[PDB]
Design a protein around this ligand. Structure first.
Ligand SMILES: O=C(O)c1ccc(-c2cc(O)c(=O)[nH]c2-c2ccc(F)cc2)cc1
Ligand SMILES: [Mg+2]
Ligand SMILES: [Mn+2]
Ligand SMILES: [Mn+2]
Length: 202
């Protein structure tokens, strides 16, 4: 079929909020979304996975974890996850420092993606176009702390998480994997997948 543009794909298949946050991020690091288009789509995918990882997870009045999949969260509920990805450098480190000085969790040396108030640990989310095992070791080599939890997703359904601890239930992670499959399939229908997959480096 005809070859579409990655630009058109991102703006049509991702929520405007995600696209905007992704554009601001690329600008902050000095890359143009309209040239580094495969990276643009990868940033949006990763960010959406971070949001979906946190969607619907709260802590109830008793202080334990529960899922509320409706858009009516009781006021006494607190979000289970703090989201760090998507913020600018200054706000991201402001959130991190706040969490650390509050919980005693030592400060990470690279910005993580989430903080889990249930497990009391930061999370590094990974979305790889290659083997999860290869990508996990890459991420881990940047974290000699051992305290930040790692959770890797692939576009073909494989996962790898630190100590075989996957944090979320199967249904939550199934939503993420289903979304990643939809992304891959739509890119393929537009003849964008081959280039997008091969453009990952590490
Ligand atoms: O080469 C690419 O296509 C690419 C490489 C790395 C990332 C990425 C991965 C992460 O796990 C993360 O937390 N974050 C990022 C991330 C997020 C926003 C940015 F502006 C840059 C990198 C995303 C894309
Ligand atoms: Mg980031
Ligand atoms: Mn990140
Ligand atoms: Mn990440």
């Amino acid at each position: 079929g005809p070859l579409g543009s990655m630009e058109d794909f991102v703006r049509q298949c991702f929520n405007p909020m995600i696209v905007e946050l992704a554009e601001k991020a690329m600008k902050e690091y000095g890359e143009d979304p309209k040239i580094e288009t495969n990276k643009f789509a990868a940033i949006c995918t990763h960010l959406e996975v971070c949001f979906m990882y946190s969607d619907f997870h709260f802590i109830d009045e008793r202080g334990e974890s529960i899922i509320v999949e409706s858009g009516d969260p009781n006021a006494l509920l607190k979000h289970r996850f703090e989201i760090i990805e998507g913020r600018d450098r200054i706000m991201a480190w402001t959130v991190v420092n706040s969490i650390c000085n509050t919980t005693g969790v030592e400060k990470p040396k690279f910005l993580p993606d989430l903080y889990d108030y249930k497990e009391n640990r930061f999370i590094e989310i990974g979305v790889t176009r290659r083997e999860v095992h290869i990508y996990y070791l890459e991420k881990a080599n940047k974290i000699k702390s051992e305290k930040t939890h790692i959770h890797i997703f692939s576009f073909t359904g494989e996962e790898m998480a630190t100590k075989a601890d996957y944090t979320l239930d199967e249904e939550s992670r199934a939503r993420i994997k289903t979304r990643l499959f939809t992304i891959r399939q739509e890119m393929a229908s537009r003849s964008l997948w081959d280039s997008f997959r091969q453009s990952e480096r590490g």
